[PDB]
Amino acid sequence: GSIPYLDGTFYLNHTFKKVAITFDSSVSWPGNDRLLTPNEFEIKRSVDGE
Amino acid sequence: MSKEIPTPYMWSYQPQMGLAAGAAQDYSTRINYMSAGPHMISRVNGIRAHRNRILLEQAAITTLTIRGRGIQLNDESVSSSLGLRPDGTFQIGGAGRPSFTPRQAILTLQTSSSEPRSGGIGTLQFIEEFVPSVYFNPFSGPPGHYPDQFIPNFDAVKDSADGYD
Amino acid sequence: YMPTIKEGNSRELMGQQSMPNRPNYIAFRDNFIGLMYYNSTGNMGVLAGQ
């Protein structure tokens, strides 16, 4: 069938939940509290809608 | 490779302690000229020599209304408004005008630490001090004369820190 | 001990025996543990400068 790695027909991006980026395992990259959540690129929030 | 134009070594920082971890040759920015002739190869070697000259040199040479803490504050000493004090008779209700006393409040607010520190290094000073270092003739001496700072598993006092205890 | 499954007063039911039910001591937990939400992204205690 299709080859999303080759052709570009990606269709699973909706299943990501969290992405955390840390340099040297102590410093988060957006390291100035420049997000609503503290240090995670929270992509999609579950039913826990604060 | 060449003991005269060497790929530089780039330090690795340990944020947590403030010391500098082991370093290594730069391995992410190499140029792949393996498909070039003598012209471009000499040009690239000259470029890397220029980069090394820039590094060596850099390293070696380059090493009222007080602001309060970002929001200035005004300062008054005789701003005392409510001169009354509750003796046996009076009964003073809610009050209070917050004013910074010139000597007491401000100086007590801007005193430094009691005794200065002695330990690791912060990020900015690490960036300013630990430029990539160019190692010209690698490991050309007898054993024990090598730069041990490069090995991350090497402790300055107790030599060759055994990993895993 | 139920001598016979049949209902209604009769000779068999006269010999029945009973014992007290086991005790329960339902009460609030130690230190009121669990009353306040702790360590849950769904419900997070918030304290901030207004």
Swiss-Prot record, chain B:
Q: Name one Pfam family in it.
A: Adeno_PVIII
This entry's Gene Ontology molecular function terms read: hexon binding
One GO cellular component from the entry? Answer: viral capsid
The cross-references to InterPro entries, in alphabetical order and at most eight, read:
Adeno_PVIII (IPR000646)
Q: Give the domain of life.
A: Viruses
Question: How would you describe the post-translational modification of this protein?
Answer: Cleaved by the viral protease during virion maturation. May cause the middle segment to be shed from the capsid.
Cite the entry's keywords alphabetically.
Capsid protein, Host nucleus, Late protein, Phosphoprotein, Virion
Signal peptide stretch? none
Q: Outline the inducing conditions.
A: Expressed in the late phase of the viral replicative cycle.
Residues marked Cleavage (site): 95-96
- Residue numbers covered by the propeptide annotation in the UniProt entry: 64-95
Which residue positions does Phosphoserine occur at? 112
**Which HAMAP family does this one have?**
ADV_CAP8
What else the UniProt entry mentions is: All late proteins expressed from the major late promoter are produced by alternative splicing and alternative polyadenylation of the same gene giving rise to non-overlapping ORFs. A leader sequence is present in the N-terminus of all these mRNAs and is recognized by the viral shutoff protein to provide expression although conventional translation via ribosome scanning from the cap has been shut off in the host cell.
* Subunit structure, as described in the record: Interacts with the peripentonal hexons as well as the hexons in the facets. Part of a complex composed of the core-capsid bridging protein, the endosome lysis protein VI and the hexon-linking protein VIII; these interactions bridge the virus core to the capsid.
State what protein this is by name.
Pre-hexon-linking protein VIII
- Phylogenetic lineage: Viruses, Varidnaviria, Bamfordvirae, Preplasmiviricota, Tectiliviricetes
Question: Which gene is annotated as encoding this protein in its UniProt record?
Answer: L4
UniProtKB/Swiss-Prot annotation, chain C:
Give the superkingdom in one word: Viruses
Q: What induces it?
A: Expressed in the late phase of the viral replicative cycle.
Task: State its location(s).
Answer: Virion; Host nucleus
Q: State how it assembles.
A: Homotrimer. Interacts with the capsid vertex protein; this interaction binds the peripentonal hexons to the neighboring penton base. Interacts with the hexon-linking protein; this interaction tethers the hexons surrounding the penton to those situated in the central plate of the facet. Interacts with the hexon-interlacing protein; this interaction lashes the hexons together. Interacts with host dyneins DYNC1LI1 and DYNC1I2; this interaction might be involved in intracellular microtubule-dependent transport of incoming viral capsid.
Family according to the record: Belongs to the adenoviridae hexon protein family.
Q: What is its biological role?
A: Major capsid protein that self-associates to form 240 hexon trimers, each in the shape of a hexagon, building most of the pseudo T=25 capsid. Assembled into trimeric units with the help of the chaperone shutoff protein. Transported by pre-protein VI to the nucleus where it associates with other structural proteins to form an empty capsid. Might be involved, through its interaction with host dyneins, in the intracellular microtubule-dependent transport of incoming viral capsid to the nucleus.
Leftover remarks: All late proteins expressed from the major late promoter are produced by alternative splicing and alternative polyadenylation of the same gene giving rise to non-overlapping ORFs. A leader sequence is present in the N-terminus of all these mRNAs and is recognized by the viral shutoff protein to provide expression although conventional translation via ribosome scanning from the cap has been shut off in the host cell.
Q: State the protein's name.
A: Hexon protein
Q: What organism is listed for this UniProt entry?
A: Human adenovirus C serotype 5 (HAdV-5)
Gene encoding this polypeptide? L3
